[model samples]
Target: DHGFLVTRHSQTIDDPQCPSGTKILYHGYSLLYVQGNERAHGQDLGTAGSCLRKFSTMPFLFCNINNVCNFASRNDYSYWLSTPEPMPMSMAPITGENIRPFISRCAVCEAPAMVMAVHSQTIQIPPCPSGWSSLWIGYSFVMHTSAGAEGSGQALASPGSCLEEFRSAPFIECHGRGTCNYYANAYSFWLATIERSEMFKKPTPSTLKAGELRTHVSRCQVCMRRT
Candidate 1:
């Protein structure tokens, strides 16, 4: 009976069984590395590390196949693709006129004196390892609440001033319902402006606002779900 046979090909120069004409193939995984230092990436100090930390550890899958290979060889050569490894963060000078709004928002929260003011200067986009581009810029703020209180009644009007008070409060919580609401509100505001400017189309104001409000409500409802 006529039959087809399958054979594996060399992925590296070290593999011995490959035919003499075969060439060694190399492949690499793309990883994203976000600079931990906000100042290092042109972000306001102290705000950089929180949101950017997890992105630094995330990895993306990628592969390189030998150019001459057919289906059979392609299958054999697939394993050469390397798994992702930790990569050093990169710092890039920020560009595009659009970045100013985000910087302004951050500066307002970081320094109240900067509110209602606009500044133009180069910022930096933290380096992403490989196979990835920086997709979002995140913002965070501190909230102050009374002891034993479950949430703040409203978003802080002056985030910069509230920051120190929130930090020093005796019963501060990081993931409180009120905090989530504030973040959602801020995110919605930012996204709305971005959409109006044609920089992005997703997360329409209604959708974003509703989604964030839901998150806030859910947190309140499930505050002690696990314990």
Candidate 2:
């Protein structure tokens, strides 16, 4: 290791592929990608040629499981961290006693439940019908933690008063379906929307009001359900 003006790139090229959201690493590179279309197939990042080259260079054992199309790095990242596998370089021996790791929807009948599923929750629904249709919606979820504590809220929207609630850049629109909404994460919960009109027609031979309006809803929470 003299004063080498031409420092080697080595078999390991000081790879700076650490872009972050969802990550992947190989012998030569570690890549971070923001997922695009979920239904994408074939050359996901146009790495077909590069994968073939790697297959030729690396040992057969490495390439036997990985190919251009099949690998754990696929768009299905909901359970990426949950899978157990034998990784080589990425994980290091926890020499020091490290602190525990931290952790980090929708609407429309539209109905939505702003929910932090990991925490204790109180299911609050009106005890009686409010005459007008009711819809619940949720919005703007940032991160989650593993402490078994978190919360979310959703509300109803009407004609011109649709459910858009935020004053910042990355706001959550508490409207419509929350399935795969923009800028969502693993903890993003969608309870599915249910428009009252979409329900079954009246009771047999008589037109009936959905339910009697009673103001006793605030006292009717018998118990809460959280899991």
Candidate 3:
């Protein structure tokens, strides 16, 4: 694939692979000289669309992005991407506009012919369409039950046999001290995976509130058209 690195500040590059036309899609952040046997690609912060700004630029490189965007495991260490300068910091959230955009590198590549989200309730690695390629695979919650009075109580309808599942960061933090204690139970929530899927236990309960948690999740893959 025709891929190159770009930062939030420096959004310009020339690559021979994307001669016809070029489109930039944000993947994730990267850090330089991560100390360990494992390669450190920051973390998958969230959807790239939110971070895009027409005005001011933040300081940091935007690369793992190869690591963060693709590397599907949780490693919470202060990482820095090399540019003119770097900053030391920790992890990012799935959603929150107020949180400052992280300083790191982003993955920029030629736009594929198509891109899509595919999910499976039973299979961890859902097969992609013929000739298509998988950008990455991660897990997310599928609506198993609804607390609504007139609720159909079925998985929400979508385009294909499966519903469209979106992407997000892998790791999470307990909010406001022991606030997460009340919600504790023996259940599973689908999480993200950068490489391949492995067997794991699943999470529970029926009397869930509209905002309260309900278990039962699925594995998802972000598939792309290669041809």
Worst 10 residues of 1 by lDDT: 218-227
Residue 204, model 1, lDDT: 41
Writing each residue's lDDT as its tens digit, candidate 1 over 87-106 gives 11332222233211111111
> What is each predicted model's overall lDDT from 0 to 1?
0.18, 0.19, 0.31
Q: In model 1, where do residues sit more than 4 Å from their true spots? A: 1-94, 105-227
Clashing pairs in 1: 90-127, 94-123
Clashes of 2: 10
- Give the Cα error of residue 94 in candidate 2, in Å: 14
The alpha-carbon deviation from the true structure for residue 164 of candidate 3, after best TM-score superposition, in angstroms, is 15
Cα-based lDDT at residue 137, candidate 2: 19
- Supply candidate 3's per-residue lDDT for 43: 23
| Candidate 2 segments whose C-alpha is farther than 4 A from its true place | 1-99, 103-189, 193-195, 199-227
Q: For residues 142-192, what per-residue lDDT tens digits would candidate 2 score against the true structure? A: 222111222222222111111122111121111111111112232422222
TM-score of each: 0.14, 0.15, 0.31
Q: Would you list the rank order by TM-score, best first?
A: 3, 2, 1
